[PDB]
Amino acid sequence: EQFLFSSESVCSGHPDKLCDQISDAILDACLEQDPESFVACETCTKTGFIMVFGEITTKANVNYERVVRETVKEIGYDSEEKGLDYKTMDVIIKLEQCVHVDKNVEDIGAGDQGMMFGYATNETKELMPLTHVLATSITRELDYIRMKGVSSRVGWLRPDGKAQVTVEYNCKHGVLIPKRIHTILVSVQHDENIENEEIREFVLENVIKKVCPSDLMDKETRILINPSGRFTIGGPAADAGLTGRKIIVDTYGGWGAHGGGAFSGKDATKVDRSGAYMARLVAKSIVFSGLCSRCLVQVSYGAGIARPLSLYINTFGTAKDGYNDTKLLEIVNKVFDFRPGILIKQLNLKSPIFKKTSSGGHFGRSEKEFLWEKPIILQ
């Protein structure tokens, strides 16, 4: 019994991801002056404009307009023909800003309700689904060549684009075993003076073949590169963008599950972010410890309440002999603490580490500053 499954990723210049990055550049700018900052910073864009809007409580003195322009510049949007120009766009800033019983860190309530999921799988060394890894690898490599490669070689790349990878799998006892890459689709924005025939050679040789393992590719793997035609018109001029519109690219590529909350623009008291990060660490620690091959974790909160309203663990029948999901929950409850004050301290989430998370996926990441990717040995 084989099956096909697909995941996607988008380039840092995709309009939705541009907004996630601005939202998190603003978060980081606040935190670097004031670690205690509250930030709910939303970003939206379309032809010729960016708006940042929401609520910030901070002691930082941040020039938001300048943070927005510098972010857009770093991404490569420096001409209206590319879909946006950091020099010329309009930047609209619409950011705004009782006795309580004294509370220790253990006592601090979640700031909202909602649920968050974490996921891990031993398919890859990142403990992520192969589909998501490959799609993400493609967009991340495109972005790195564009933003770091020599103009004579890659000066024709523009910021927008996407990738979608279909893997053919076998499943043996709930364990997922990739069999081959079935389809690789890449959309990449480009200057008018290069044609698609050239683009296809370049992407195949310098991106696809560099990040996809050759033992998973064969003469039947379908490679689709700008199949519909040329892609010169892109970015905000071609498609509106908004923060929190790429939540599946930011997480598991369709595997696992999602509670619905976006990550970018939100400080660590937003359990939508912090809870998902903790739930990743749990799932990843369970798989890394060899107690299962795949793991889904759900946590749920209520506004004002410190302890989660519920916790759930599923290992899809892959639990090691002598363990089940009942016992693993008991182990999780001995080791991990999902009360938000505790989790934020454990994961160092008042540090200005978030801009790097806002493209490339929040999970499966090697960066030393992401503590939710450094698994605990459990038994």
Using rule CB under 8 A, residue 249 touches its own copies: yes
Return the exposure string of 93-129: e unless at least 16 CB atoms fall within 10 Å of the residue's CB, then b.
eebeeeeeeeeeeeebbbbeebbbbbbbbbbeebbbb
**30-38, 108-116, 202-210, 220-228 -> range binding Mg ion (CB under 5 A):** 108-116
82 is catalytic: no
Q: How many helices (H) and strands (E) does the chain have?
A: 9, 13
CB 332 within 8 A of CB 16: no
16 is in an annotated binding site: yes
Tell the smallest beta-carbon distance from residue 202 to its own copies (Å). 19
User: CA dihedral in degrees (368, 341, 313, 321; nearest 10)?
Assistant: 60
Under rule CB under 8 A, residue 114 binds its own copies? yes
**Judged by CB under 5 A, does residue 245 bind Mg ion?**
yes
Q: Does 14 bind Mg ion (CB under 5 A)?
A: no
371 binds its own copies (CB under 8 A): no
What are the tokens at 271? 């359990």
CB of 362 to Mg ion, least distance (A): 16
Which C-beta is closer to its own copies: that of 229 or that of 322?
A: 229
Phi, psi dihedral angles at 308 (to 5 degrees): -60, 145
Please report the DSSP string for 83-130 in residue order: TEETTT-EEEEEEE--------GGGPPBSS-EEEEEEEETTSTTSS-H
**Nearest-approach distance from CB 9 to Mg ion, in angstroms:** 11
The type of residue at 308 is P
CA distance linking residue 257 with residue 276, whole number of Å: 11
**Rounded to 5°, angle at Cα 335 from 330 and 337:** 100
Q: Is 321 marked active-site?
A: no
Region binding its own copies by CB under 8 A among candidate stretches 120-128, 219-227, 344-352, 358-366: 219-227
Q: Any catalytic annotation for residue 162?
A: yes
Q: Which parts of 135-174 interact with its own copies (CB under 8 A)?
A: 162, 164, 166
Residue 63, SS3 per DSSP: coil
Residue 263 within binding range of its own copies, rule CB under 8 A: no
Among 44, 157, 286, 349, binds its own copies (CB under 8 A): 44
Q: Which is nearer to Mg ion, 303 or 335 (CB)?
A: 303
Half-sphere exposure of 72 (CA within 13 A, CB side): 32
Q: Is 114 in the site for Mg ion (CB under 5 A)?
A: yes
Annotated catalytic residue 179: no
93 binds its own copies (CB under 8 A): no
Residue closest to 223 by CA, chosen among 234, 212, 233: 212
C-beta of 83 vs 261, nearer to Mg ion: 261
CB 270 to Mg ion: min, Å: 8
Identify the three-state secondary structure at position 269: coil
Please say if 230 is a catalytic residue: no
* Of 48 and 149, CB closest to its own copies: 48
Nearer to Mg ion, 16 or 126 (CB): 16
- Please identify which residue in 324, 345, 367, 374 interacts with its own copies, judged by CB under 8 A: 324
Task: Please report which helix (H) or strand (E) contains residue 163, including its range.
Answer: strand 157-172
Going from the C-alpha of 110 to that of each of 115, 144, 262, 271, 372, the distances in angstroms are: 11, 37, 16, 7, 19
Nearer to Mg ion (CB atom), residue 16 or residue 250? 16
Q: What's the number of CA atoms in the CB half-sphere (13 Å) around residue 322?
A: 4
261 near Mg ion, judged by CB under 5 A: yes
Residues that bind Mg ion (CB under 5 A): 16, 114, 245, 261
Numbered residues of the known binding site for Mg(2+): 16
Residues that bind its own copies (CB under 8 A): 1-8, 40, 42, 44, 46-47, 49, 51, 53-55, 94, 96, 109, 113-115, 117, 162, 164, 166, 182-183, 185, 187, 222, 224, 227-229, 239-240, 242-249, 254-260, 262, 298, 300, 302-305, 309-314, 324-326
